[PDB]
Write a protein that binds this ligand. Structure first.
Ligand SMILES: COc1cc2c(cc1OC)[C@H]1Cc3ccc(OC)c(OC)c3CN1CC2
Ligand SMILES: COc1cc2c(cc1OC)[C@H]1Cc3ccc(OC)c(OC)c3CN1CC2
Lengths: 183, 183
């Protein structure tokens, strides 16, 4: 649909030009009038919230399928989630570049945040037992996600530039992320 | 001099368009012919190395002056260095955006890396006792710097967007950086 085209154009524009990207640019790049964009997303805020759910789901749905019926401890599940996320961002640079800006956005609604939290219950539960309490507070939750994405971004940058050592940067990134964010 | 203008234009271009930025763009933005740029920096590699020393020194020289004749432990000195760095990046976004790309560049020479290491001996010594050994290895030194800059960047982004909580994001960033990078 045009909706998927819009979502893709919004991913590219936000990855490239930041979360501030124009609805005009986004509409133009999807090959539609801006008025058409507005029929699908009345507000930039709606677009941020919908795009974030769509991109989060793009990664999360494949991860849920891979992990299903495994028995993991907290750290194992979290390492799988981290390695999966780096793979996804390597495969889909713009998706990662857009999502890490969306996830820390002031414009996310409580409903959206709750949907993201509950999309993968097994992981939510593991994170609740593992994440430093400060980074599950209303005030600092987005900052803890930001730090994850920052470390993930660095990891992807080194893995892409020096693919010979990709797994080493992913493991070292994971280890630093774990220390930085867990109890 | 034109050299300072070139360094400033190279800071802006690299911050904006990445370490890949054109010598033509850089020369144009400094108001000189590209041939003139080449009289000051024969190679893009020379420009990366010189710009990185210049920007590192821009922060480090003021930090050395502030810390002089203090008695600090490792962690105190490192917290001062981190808070100083966030202040600098808030005051000088392009300087931070350029430097974090320069510092992980494959084009840095051994001489440059050694000059950066030795510019502030007291801090070098403290870091040698504090930094995880992996992040002082030849192979992963740049990756450990990258992770620092990533966490610093996130911290600056939240401190700039939500200045009411700047010190809280700086302290939480510092705490995560410390866990991620130290023994
Ligand atoms: C787009 O796909 C994802 C992105 C993210 C996630 C999970 C995702 O897929 C399921 C998780 C994964 C994760 C790991 C470890 C954490 O702290 C120890 C953590 O809290 C800060 C977080 C919270 N989220 C960070 C961003
Ligand atoms: C541009 O100015 C600076 C940038 C940086 C530095 C110091 C600087 O000014 C003196 C230091 C500060 C610092 C802290 C803690 C570290 O690990 C615990 C560390 O190793 C990774 C590093 C290494 N460098 C990161 C980048």
């Amino acid at each position: 649909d045009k909706k998927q085209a819009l979502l893709e154009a919004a991913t590219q524009a936000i990855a490239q030009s930041g979360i501030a990207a124009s609805t005009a640019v986004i509409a133009r790049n999807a090959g539609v009038a801006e008025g058409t964009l507005f029929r699908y997303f009345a507000t930039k805020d709606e677009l941020i919230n919908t795009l974030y759910l769509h991109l989060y789901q793009d990664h999360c749905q494949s991860l849920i399928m891979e992990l299903d019926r495994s028995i993991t401890d907290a750290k194992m599940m979290i390492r799988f989630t981290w390695n999966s996320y780096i793979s996804w961002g390597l495969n889909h640079p713009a998706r990662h570049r857009a999502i890490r800006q969306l996830a820390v956005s002031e414009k996310l609604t409580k409903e959206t945040k709750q949907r993201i939290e509950d999309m993968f219950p097994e992981l939510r539960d593991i994170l609740h037992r593992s994440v430093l309490m400060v980074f599950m507070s209303d005030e600092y939750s987005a900052f803890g996600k930001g730090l994850f994405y920052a470390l993930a971004e660095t990891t992807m940058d080194f893995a892409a530039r020096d693919p010979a050592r990709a797994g080493e940067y992913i493991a070292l990134g994971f280890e630093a992320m774990w220390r930085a964010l867990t109890r």
